[PDB]
Design an enzyme around this catalytic site. Structure first.
Site, PDB file in Angstrom:
ATOM      1  N   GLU A 199     -19.369 -11.902 -20.921  1.00  0.00           N
ATOM      2  CA  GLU A 199     -18.937 -12.963 -20.019  1.00  0.00           C
ATOM      3  C   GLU A 199     -20.115 -13.601 -19.294  1.00  0.00           C
ATOM      4  O   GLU A 199     -19.998 -14.736 -18.811  1.00  0.00           O
ATOM      5  CB  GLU A 199     -17.921 -12.420 -19.014  1.00  0.00           C
ATOM      6  CG  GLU A 199     -16.470 -12.620 -19.436  1.00  0.00           C
ATOM      7  CD  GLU A 199     -16.037 -14.073 -19.400  1.00  0.00           C
ATOM      8  OE1 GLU A 199     -15.008 -14.403 -20.027  1.00  0.00           O
ATOM      9  OE2 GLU A 199     -16.719 -14.884 -18.741  1.00  0.00           O
ATOM     10  N   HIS A 202     -17.814 -23.017 -20.037  1.00  0.00           N
ATOM     11  CA  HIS A 202     -17.864 -21.564 -19.925  1.00  0.00           C
ATOM     12  C   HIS A 202     -17.538 -20.903 -21.255  1.00  0.00           C
ATOM     13  O   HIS A 202     -18.272 -20.025 -21.725  1.00  0.00           O
ATOM     14  CB  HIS A 202     -16.881 -21.108 -18.846  1.00  0.00           C
ATOM     15  CG  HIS A 202     -16.845 -19.627 -18.641  1.00  0.00           C
ATOM     16  ND1 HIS A 202     -17.846 -18.942 -17.988  1.00  0.00           N
ATOM     17  CD2 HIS A 202     -15.932 -18.700 -19.010  1.00  0.00           C
ATOM     18  CE1 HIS A 202     -17.548 -17.655 -17.959  1.00  0.00           C
ATOM     19  NE2 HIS A 202     -16.392 -17.481 -18.573  1.00  0.00           N
ATOM     20  N   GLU A 203     -16.444 -21.321 -21.883  1.00  0.00           N
ATOM     21  CA  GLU A 203     -16.069 -20.756 -23.172  1.00  0.00           C
ATOM     22  C   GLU A 203     -16.959 -21.241 -24.312  1.00  0.00           C
ATOM     23  O   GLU A 203     -17.297 -20.446 -25.199  1.00  0.00           O
ATOM     24  CB  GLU A 203     -14.605 -21.074 -23.484  1.00  0.00           C
ATOM     25  CG  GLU A 203     -13.647 -20.831 -22.327  1.00  0.00           C
ATOM     26  CD  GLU A 203     -13.558 -19.369 -21.930  1.00  0.00           C
ATOM     27  OE1 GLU A 203     -13.695 -18.500 -22.817  1.00  0.00           O
ATOM     28  OE2 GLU A 203     -13.346 -19.088 -20.732  1.00  0.00           O
ATOM     29  N   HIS A 259      -4.197 -17.216 -21.922  1.00  0.00           N
ATOM     30  CA  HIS A 259      -5.044 -16.455 -21.012  1.00  0.00           C
ATOM     31  C   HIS A 259      -6.521 -16.751 -21.266  1.00  0.00           C
ATOM     32  O   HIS A 259      -6.947 -16.881 -22.417  1.00  0.00           O
ATOM     33  CB  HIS A 259      -4.786 -14.960 -21.162  1.00  0.00           C
ATOM     34  CG  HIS A 259      -3.405 -14.544 -20.766  1.00  0.00           C
ATOM     35  ND1 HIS A 259      -3.004 -14.452 -19.451  1.00  0.00           N
ATOM     36  CD2 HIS A 259      -2.329 -14.197 -21.511  1.00  0.00           C
ATOM     37  CE1 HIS A 259      -1.742 -14.066 -19.402  1.00  0.00           C
ATOM     38  NE2 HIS A 259      -1.309 -13.905 -20.639  1.00  0.00           N
ATOM     39  N   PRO A 260      -7.320 -16.852 -20.195  1.00  0.00           N
ATOM     40  CA  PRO A 260      -8.723 -17.269 -20.348  1.00  0.00           C
ATOM     41  C   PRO A 260      -9.637 -16.187 -20.903  1.00  0.00           C
ATOM     42  O   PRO A 260     -10.506 -15.677 -20.189  1.00  0.00           O
ATOM     43  CB  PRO A 260      -9.128 -17.652 -18.919  1.00  0.00           C
ATOM     44  CG  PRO A 260      -8.223 -16.854 -18.047  1.00  0.00           C
ATOM     45  CD  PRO A 260      -6.923 -16.729 -18.783  1.00  0.00           C
ATOM     46  N   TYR A 301     -19.999  -6.517 -13.883  1.00  0.00           N
ATOM     47  CA  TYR A 301     -20.154  -7.577 -12.892  1.00  0.00           C
ATOM     48  C   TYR A 301     -21.496  -7.505 -12.172  1.00  0.00           C
ATOM     49  O   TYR A 301     -22.136  -8.536 -11.949  1.00  0.00           O
ATOM     50  CB  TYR A 301     -18.988  -7.572 -11.901  1.00  0.00           C
ATOM     51  CG  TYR A 301     -17.628  -7.760 -12.545  1.00  0.00           C
ATOM     52  CD1 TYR A 301     -17.052  -6.776 -13.331  1.00  0.00           C
ATOM     53  CD2 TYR A 301     -16.920  -8.943 -12.357  1.00  0.00           C
ATOM     54  CE1 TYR A 301     -15.812  -6.966 -13.921  1.00  0.00           C
ATOM     55  CE2 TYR A 301     -15.680  -9.137 -12.936  1.00  0.00           C
ATOM     56  CZ  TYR A 301     -15.130  -8.146 -13.716  1.00  0.00           C
ATOM     57  OH  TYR A 301     -13.896  -8.335 -14.294  1.00  0.00           O
ATOM     58  N   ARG A 328       0.819  -1.207   0.000  1.00  0.00           N
ATOM     59  CA  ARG A 328       0.000   0.000   0.000  1.00  0.00           C
ATOM     60  C   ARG A 328       0.855   1.261   0.000  1.00  0.00           C
ATOM     61  O   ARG A 328       0.652   2.151  -0.838  1.00  0.00           O
ATOM     62  CB  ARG A 328      -0.950  -0.004   1.198  1.00  0.00           C
ATOM     63  CG  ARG A 328      -1.806   1.246   1.303  1.00  0.00           C
ATOM     64  CD  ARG A 328      -2.787   1.155   2.457  1.00  0.00           C
ATOM     65  NE  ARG A 328      -3.801   0.132   2.227  1.00  0.00           N
ATOM     66  CZ  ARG A 328      -4.628  -0.327   3.161  1.00  0.00           C
ATOM     67  NH1 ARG A 328      -4.561   0.140   4.400  1.00  0.00           N
ATOM     68  NH2 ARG A 328      -5.522  -1.256   2.853  1.00  0.00           N
ATOM     69  N   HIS A 342      -7.995  -4.606 -14.427  1.00  0.00           N
ATOM     70  CA  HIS A 342      -9.302  -4.196 -14.905  1.00  0.00           C
ATOM     71  C   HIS A 342      -9.605  -2.728 -14.643  1.00  0.00           C
ATOM     72  O   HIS A 342     -10.744  -2.308 -14.848  1.00  0.00           O
ATOM     73  CB  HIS A 342     -10.371  -5.072 -14.256  1.00  0.00           C
ATOM     74  CG  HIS A 342     -10.290  -6.512 -14.657  1.00  0.00           C
ATOM     75  ND1 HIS A 342     -10.988  -7.017 -15.732  1.00  0.00           N
ATOM     76  CD2 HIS A 342      -9.615  -7.556 -14.121  1.00  0.00           C
ATOM     77  CE1 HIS A 342     -10.738  -8.309 -15.849  1.00  0.00           C
ATOM     78  NE2 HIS A 342      -9.909  -8.662 -14.883  1.00  0.00           N
ATOM     79  N   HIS A 376     -20.428 -19.412 -24.844  1.00  0.00           N
ATOM     80  CA  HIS A 376     -20.338 -18.145 -25.552  1.00  0.00           C
ATOM     81  C   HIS A 376     -19.887 -18.350 -26.988  1.00  0.00           C
ATOM     82  O   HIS A 376     -20.218 -17.549 -27.866  1.00  0.00           O
ATOM     83  CB  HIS A 376     -19.401 -17.177 -24.835  1.00  0.00           C
ATOM     84  CG  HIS A 376     -19.500 -15.771 -25.344  1.00  0.00           C
ATOM     85  ND1 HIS A 376     -19.571 -15.464 -26.686  1.00  0.00           N
ATOM     86  CD2 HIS A 376     -19.564 -14.591 -24.687  1.00  0.00           C
ATOM     87  CE1 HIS A 376     -19.665 -14.155 -26.833  1.00  0.00           C
ATOM     88  NE2 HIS A 376     -19.666 -13.602 -25.635  1.00  0.00           N
TER      89      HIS A 376
END
EC number: 3.4.17.23
Lengths: 578, 198, 50
Positions: free
Chosen positions: A377, A349-350, A320-321, A487, A144, A477, A353
């Protein structure tokens, strides 16, 4: 003459030369992430320059047309992003300065070596797994005090610069640079507003804060033992116990809690060594899973062009996913695919889509994205939810008829479901609401980081602040300008669609055991929606699939009756260990 | 026959005039009418169905004797990089007459400003090109529709179907079919000599 | 002389084997008289008295 004729002429030239330029630009990136070379670097730079060159030059050519003189209301849908001006409207001095932000901040994010300490494999593992009060305290407080200090120049003309261009471009704030999408003001009746999203975020938050408050009672009462004098049930939680370095994630930690550890959880690796699981395997039985849903066979080129194996060290690449909508009858998933319990979920999951992609592939190029910015997503998430049902796993090969089950299997399913994806949405509530209030400018220039607690102290109760520190820019992100309202949106639409889908399959009661199979109508009506894509308002289409123009409240509990009643019998700031 | 049972002209779709019955009726003139298509032109090639290609690339009254023949040519000609050899008109002003060849090469006036020398705004090209590559999707894969227009002009039809001729047996009377001669009797060897043409 | 059966007619070269395929088409196709059907398509009742 006519706007529509040469409008579609320009857009069809765009389509036909965009297959060329885009498709082999995305394909240069495909050769790159497939084979990371340097001729790929230069040619991808050139291809992206030509893409941005079409953007800038032809979006100087496109603005001799007015904005309002359209009657089709779908030509509006194409002209919001066609008649737009872009980022070249302002001067040329803050152009290399916006690049300065996006490059120096990215470098500091990628070269933020603590001295050394390797960023992702070292820090993320030790921060999540160190288990002490005086060693992880070092890695946390040094983190931090090392990161939240040097960003004051970059971030504190960052906000004013984006706010200034927002006002200069006839907008209200850097959010109004974005939120303009959510004023549906074309076809009437199916309209919506953009000015605030306080509605239904506190309102649905005022409905989850009961459920989250019960869950927080349980969690805040669980961690008594580890810190005797520092944790109490009448006070609230300390600074560094989110299960993650910011704790953005709420579906994992059943392992630091044992209400029911007696029943064996699901395991398929024994099945993996038993029954000819090959990594060319379940993918095809995933295909027949979607057939059970009602979807056609997967294309033949996919077994050939798309990479479904381990490229190994000999093939330099990164797995990378993030799936790839390569388009042009080509839609790809470049993954170092392995057979694992979480990889089992990831495959579906993939592929959910990817099937969505071939579903709306029949749409022109400009309308070849997800239904809305959060739905992308969300498509993978809802399909993972649909395929993750355990009794359906008993309905298929990867389980034995002698596999007995009880009702407590789902108990740690959910108390897993507390620390990698969803459960504590209120952290996203904190971070995002504070981010709108800081980027838009309704907070003065030394009042970020007090709020970088008391919103915790009000919503989740994470405490230790003073004026200056600026935490919220140190993420993959946020250092790449991504907003987490996607989200929140997926967290809701996930379960409205889940309720609609499982109700359509003649499965009622609690929604934790609905199997979506052998349902052509659940596929037929889904087609009527998915084929449209973004051609219709999400309100009307939502009523077509679920039944309302706004998010529902009852389904959220319709999934969660057992956890509801189980919370009630174990849930039985202005307090300081500091 | 070979085209019918060729097992290679995969999209041999001759809805209408019967290939099963073609092999006896004569046509005076037949027509080689071939171009290049894609996997989307398949449904676009459906006489009666219309679209961009039917209006601006090929022509059709509504009906004509003559079939359509396409088959996967992707393996034949598809180089990495893009098959820019082939090309297509994209957007014409209007349609044309049924079935005429056109190589009109000019600049399309798209909008308000007259072209009258300029190629820029309101003055774009309809002429685009293809970029075929081996990974191209099904809806785009070239199959090459070929047409078979059969026109039966009033003059007697010169090209005909085959003549299925069997063996001849003599010294025991049969019905017989010597090209019009259809009697009923015994054939035998004979001696009397003919001239070269009788 | 009559004909009642609804046998799957073989519509070409590749045998039907009971199912669809290259040149296999079902002879039984309904009228389904809709108002959009033209006068050349409108139904007409016929009675024959031998």
């Amino acid at each position: 003459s006519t706007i529509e004729e040469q409008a579609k002429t320009f857009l069809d030239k765009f389509n036909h030369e965009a297959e060329d330029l885009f498709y082999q630009s995305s394909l240069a990136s495909w050769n790159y992430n497939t084979n990371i070379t340097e001729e790929n670097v230069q040619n991808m730079n050139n291809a992206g320059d030509k893409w941005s060159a079409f953007l800038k030059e032809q979006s100087t050519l496109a603005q001799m047309y007015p904005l309002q003189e359209i009657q089709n209301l779908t030509v509006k849908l194409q002209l919001q992003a066609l008649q737009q001006n872009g980022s070249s409207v302002l001067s040329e001095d803050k152009s290399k300065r916006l690049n300065t932000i996006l490059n120096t901040m990215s470098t500091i994010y990628s070269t933020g070596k603590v001295c050394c300490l390797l960023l992702e494999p070292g820090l993320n593992e030790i921060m999540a797994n160190s288990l002490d009060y005086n060693e992880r305290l070092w890695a946390w407080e040094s983190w931090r005090s090392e990161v939240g200090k040097q960003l004051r120049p970059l971030y504190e003309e960052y906000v004013v610069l984006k706010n200034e261009m927002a006002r200069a471009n006839h907008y209200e704030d850097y959010g109004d640079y974005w939120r303009g999408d959510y004023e549906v003001n074309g076809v009437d009746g199916y309209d919506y507003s953009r000015g605030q999203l306080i509605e239904d975020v506190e309102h649905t938050f005022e409905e989850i804060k009961p459920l989250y408050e019960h869950l927080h009672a349980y969690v805040r009462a669980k961690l008594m033992n580890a810190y005797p004098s520092y944790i109490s049930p009448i006070g609230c939680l300390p600074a560094h116990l989110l299960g993650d370095m910011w704790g953005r994630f709420w579906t994992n930690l059943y392992s630091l809690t044992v209400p029911f550890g007696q029943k064996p959880n699901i395991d398929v690796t024994d099945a993996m060594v038993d029954q000819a699981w090959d990594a060319q395997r379940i993918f095809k039985e995933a295909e027949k899973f979607f057939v059970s849903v009602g979807l056609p066979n997967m294309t033949q080129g996919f077994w050939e062009n798309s990479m479904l194996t381990d490229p190994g060290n000999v093939q330099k690449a990164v797995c990378h996913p993030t799936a790839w909508d390569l388009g042009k009858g080509d839609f790809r998933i470049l993954m170092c695919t392995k057979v694992t319990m979480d990889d089992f979920l990831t495959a579906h999951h993939e592929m959910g889509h990817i099937q969505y992609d071939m579903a709306y592939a029949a749409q022109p190029f400009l309308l070849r994205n997800g239904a809305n910015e959060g739905f992308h997503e969300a498509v993978g998430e809802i399909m993972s939810l649909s395929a993750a049902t355990p009794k359906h796993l008993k309905s298929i090969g990867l389980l034995s008829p002698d596999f007995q089950e009880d009702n407590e299997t789902e108990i740690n399913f959910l108390l897993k479901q507390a620390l990698t994806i969803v459960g504590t949405l209120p952290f996203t509530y904190m971070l995002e609401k504070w981010r709108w209030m800081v980027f838009k400018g309704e907070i003065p220039k030394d009042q970020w980081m007090k709020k970088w607690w008391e919103m915790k102290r009000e919503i989740v109760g994470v405490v230790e602040h003073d004026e200056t520190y600026c935490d919220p820019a140190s993420l993959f992100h946020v250092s790449n300008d991504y907003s987490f309202i996607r989200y929140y949106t997926r967290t809701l639409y996930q379960f409205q669609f889940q309720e609609a889908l499982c109700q359509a399959a003649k499965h009622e009661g609690p929604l934790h055991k609905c199997d979506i199979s052998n349902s052509t109508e659940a596929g037929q009506k889904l087609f009527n929606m998915l084929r449209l894509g973004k051609s219709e308002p999400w309100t009307l289409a939502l009523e077509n699939v679920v039944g309302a123009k706004n998010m529902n409240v009852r389904p959220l509990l319709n999934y969660f009756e057992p956890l509801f009643t189980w919370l009630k019998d174990q849930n039985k700031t202005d307090w300081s260990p500091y | 026959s070979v085209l019918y049972n060729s097992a290679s002209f995969s999209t041999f779709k001759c809805y209408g005039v019967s290939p099963t019955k073609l092999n006896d009726l004569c046509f005076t003139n037949v027509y080689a009418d071939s171009f290049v298509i894609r996997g989307d032109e398949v449904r676009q090639i459906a006489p009666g169905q219309t679209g961009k290609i039917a209006d601006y690339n090929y022509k059709l009254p509504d009906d004509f004797t003559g079939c359509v023949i396409a088959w996967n040519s992707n393996n034949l000609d598809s180089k990495v990089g893009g098959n820019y050899n082939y090309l297509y008109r994209l957007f014409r002003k209007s349609n044309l007459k049924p079935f005429e060849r056109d190589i009109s090469t000019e600049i399309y006036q798209a909008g308000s400003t007259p072209c009258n020398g300029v190629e820029g705004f309101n003055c774009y090209f309809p002429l685009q090109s293809y970029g075929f590559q081996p990974t191209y999707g099904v809806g785009y894969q070239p199959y090459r529709v070929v047409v078979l227009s059969f026109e039966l002009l009033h003059a007697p039809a010169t090209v005909c179907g085959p003549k299925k001729s069997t063996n001849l047996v003599k010294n025991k009377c049969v019905n017989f079919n010597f090209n019009g001669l259809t009697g009923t009797g015994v054939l035998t060897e004979s001696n009397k000599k003919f001239l070269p043409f009788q």
